[PDB]
């Protein structure tokens, strides 16, 4: 078995290997990359996502989210308070203000220490989940707005044509902005490209050990657990590496820098934080290997998780027994 310790693998494809996305994902899996739940892909030196980032300041962040924490430094939840709209240029200035800017630090490990020590005492503002793309239309390789759609994959694998679309999302981050422990909708893959700015630190649990994280989360968030049998679908809970280590949960960590891709694999729980002002683009995707994970994915039916239009068909076709209850949670 390849990669039996479930380490995060880093790939350096040549420009020739960068042509065929599906083929390269299957290659990475042949080497065991999925066992970690997360992989890094450094694009060939010849590649670029677009020519410059000089003209992005007029993009609108219609609903910036202030991420307010509750709990203790290593075990907390966050809720998202909606703020007034602002442009990317306005948000970048905000991120660089004395109130929100990255503190002085020695290296990524020092910054990671400071994040876990101090996150809960501040409420950073995240421009998340903005439909759109920063890939130039002329970028032909690994252009996250030109991937094969998950609806087309389900149709190719299973023969059923379904409604729905699959488009990317932009994320504008600042110091301490935080993504809570989660897997993707329907335990899909994700791919994330850091277009510009400061790094993003990731934590990930191997898919084979995901249920260990879930059991710890039920212990640590006992009211939330009683409220919903899949409360990590709410995307609000954080657990630090120190707490994970104290409770014997297998995980790994890695820092993504600008110009790098990350791939999350089906049922790979992940969480993380931004080091300073940045912009990322991400989208879900599927492969044939995903279908079995889609069929087994947990679902929130309590009403909290509320997701896209396109997840309807996935539930309806892959999980017909669950469909009725899940749809009630959507409506
Ligand atoms: O970058 C972020 O805030 C969150 N991204 C992801 O969870 C992802 O790409 O799957
Ligand atoms: Mg602009
Ligand atoms: Ni994710
Ligand atoms: Zn729920």
Look at domain 1-331 and name its CATH class: mainly beta
Question: Nearest C-alpha to atom 9 of ligand 1 is from which residue?
Answer: 192
Site of tokens 């990475």: 28
Which among 156, 165, 162 has a CA at the least distance from the CA of 288? 156
Structure token pair of residue 82? 């909606």
- Secondary structure E strands in the chain: 9-11, 38-41, 60-61, 65-72, 75-82, 86-87, 125-131, 169-173, 178-182, 189-197, 200-205, 237-239, 252-256, 261-264, 269-274, 278-285
Q: What is the resolution of this structure in A?
A: 1.5
- Name all residues whose Cβ lies below 6 A of ligand 1: 171, 179, 190, 192, 200, 264, 270, 280, 282
Residue to mutate, 192, 201, 255, ligand 1, most ligand atoms under 8 Å from C-beta: 192
Using the CB atoms, write b or e for 189-221: b if 16+ within 10 Å: bbbbbbbbbbbbbbbbbbbebbebbbebbeebb
CA 204 – CA 102 distance, rounded (Å): 23
CA 320 – CA 314 distance, rounded (Å): 9
User: Ion ligand 4 — residues with CB under 5 Å?
Assistant: 228, 300, 302, 304
Do 142 and 20 form a contact (C-beta atoms < 8 A)? Answer: no
User: Ion ligand 3 — residues with CB under 5 Å?
Assistant: 190
Do 6 and 36 form a contact (C-beta atoms < 8 A)? Answer: yes
Site of tokens 């998340």: 128
Give the angle subtended at the CA of 134 by the CAs of 262 and 81, to the nearest 5°. 80
- Cα dihedral 205, 207, 208, 210, rounded to 10, equals 60
Bridge partner residues of 80 (DSSP): 67
DSSP SS3 for 174: coil
| Alpha-carbon distances of 123 from 100, 102, 266, rounded to whole Å | 9, 13, 30
Which among 171, 192, 160, 176 has a CA at the least distance from the CA of 270? 192
Rounded to the nearest angstrom, the gap between the alpha carbon of residue 197 and the centroid of all alpha carbons in its chain is 17
* Strands laid side by side in the 189-197 sheet: 9-11, 38-41, 261-264, 189-197, 278-285, 169-173, 125-131, 65-72, 75-82, 237-239
- Residue 293 alpha carbon to ligand 1 centre in Å: 19
Supply the DSSP string of 34-103, one letter for each residue.
GGGSEEEEPPPTT--S-S-STT-TT-EESS-EEEEEEEETTEEEEEEEE---EEHHHHHHHHTSTTTSPP
CA 311 – CA 233 distance, rounded (Å): 13
φ/ψ of 119, rounded to 5, equals -50, -45
DSSP SS3 for 292: helix
Do 21 and 147 form a contact (C-beta atoms < 8 A)? Answer: yes
- Residue 270 alpha carbon to ligand 3 centre in Å: 7
Bridge partner residues of 81 (DSSP): 66
Structure token pair of residue 240? 């630090």
**In the chain, where are the structural domains located?**
1-331
What residues contact 200, with CB distance under 8 A and at least 6 apart? 173, 192, 194, 255, 256, 272, 273, 274, 275, 278, 280
| Annotated binding-site ranges for Zn(2+) | 228, 234, 300, 302
Obtained via which technique? X-ray
Q: Is the dihedral of CA 111, 113, 117, 120 positive or negative?
A: positive
DSSP SS3 for 180: strand
Question: Nearest C-alpha to atom 10 of ligand 1 is from which residue?
Answer: 190
Which atom of ligand 1 lies at the shortest distance from residue 184's CA?
A: 10
Largest CA distance in the chain: 55
User: 3-state DSSP: the chain helix, strand, coil percent, rounded to 5?
Assistant: 30, 25, 45
CA 219 – CA 237 distance, rounded (Å): 12
| Alpha-carbon distances of 215 from 49, 145, 280, 295, rounded to whole Å | 40, 36, 31, 21
Residue to mutate, 78, 173, 201, 264, ligand 1, most ligand atoms under 8 Å from C-beta: 264
Q: Which of the 8 DSSP states describes residue 233? A: G
Q: Which of the 8 DSSP states describes residue 208? A: G
Do 94 and 100 form a contact (C-beta atoms < 8 A)? Answer: yes
CA 314 – CA 154 distance, rounded (Å): 9
């Amino acid at each position: 078995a390849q990669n039996p310790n479930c380490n995060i693998m880093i790939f350096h494809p040549t420009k020739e290997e960068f042509n065929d996305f599906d083929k390269y994902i299957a290659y990475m899996e042949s080497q065991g990359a999925h066992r970690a739940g997360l992989a890094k892909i450094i694009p060939p030196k010849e590649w670029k996502a677009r020519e410059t980032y000089d003209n992005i300041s007029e993009i609108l962040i219609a609903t910036p989210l202030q991420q307010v924490a509750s709990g203790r430094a290593g075990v907390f939840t966050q809720y998202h308070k909606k703020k007034k709209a602002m442009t990317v240029g306005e948000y970048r200035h905000l991120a660089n203000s004395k109130k929100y800017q990255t503190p002085p630090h020695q290296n990524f490990e020092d910054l990671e220490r400071k994040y876990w020590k101090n996150r809960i005492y501040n409420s950073p503002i995240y421009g998340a989940d903005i439909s759109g793309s920063l890939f130039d239309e002329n970028t032909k390789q690994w252009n996250l707005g030109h991937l094969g759609t998950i609806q087309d994959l389900l149709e190719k694998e299973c023969g059923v044509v379904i409604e729905g679309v699959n488009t990317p999302y932009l994320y504008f981050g600042m110091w301490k902005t935080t993504f809570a422990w989660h897997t993707e909708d329907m335990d899909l893959y994700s791919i994330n490209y850091l277009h510009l700015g400061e790094p993003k630190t990731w934590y990930v649990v191997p898919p084979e050990h995901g249920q260990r994280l879930e059991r710890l989360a039920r212990e640590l968030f006992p009211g939330s657990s009683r409220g919903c049998g899949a409360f990590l679908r709410h995307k609000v809970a954080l657990i630090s590496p120190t707490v994970l280590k104290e409770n014997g949960i297998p995980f790994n960590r890695i820092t993504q820098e600008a110009g790098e891709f990350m791939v999350t694999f089906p049922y790979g729980y992940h969480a993380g934080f931004n080091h300073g002002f940045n912009c990322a683009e991400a989208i879900n995707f599927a492969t044939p290997r995903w279908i079995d994970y889609g069929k087994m994915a947990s679902q929130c039916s309590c009403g909290e998780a509320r997701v896209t239009f396109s997840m309807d068909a996935f539930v309806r076709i892959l999980q017909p027994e669950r469909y009725d209850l899940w749809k009630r949670g959507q409506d």
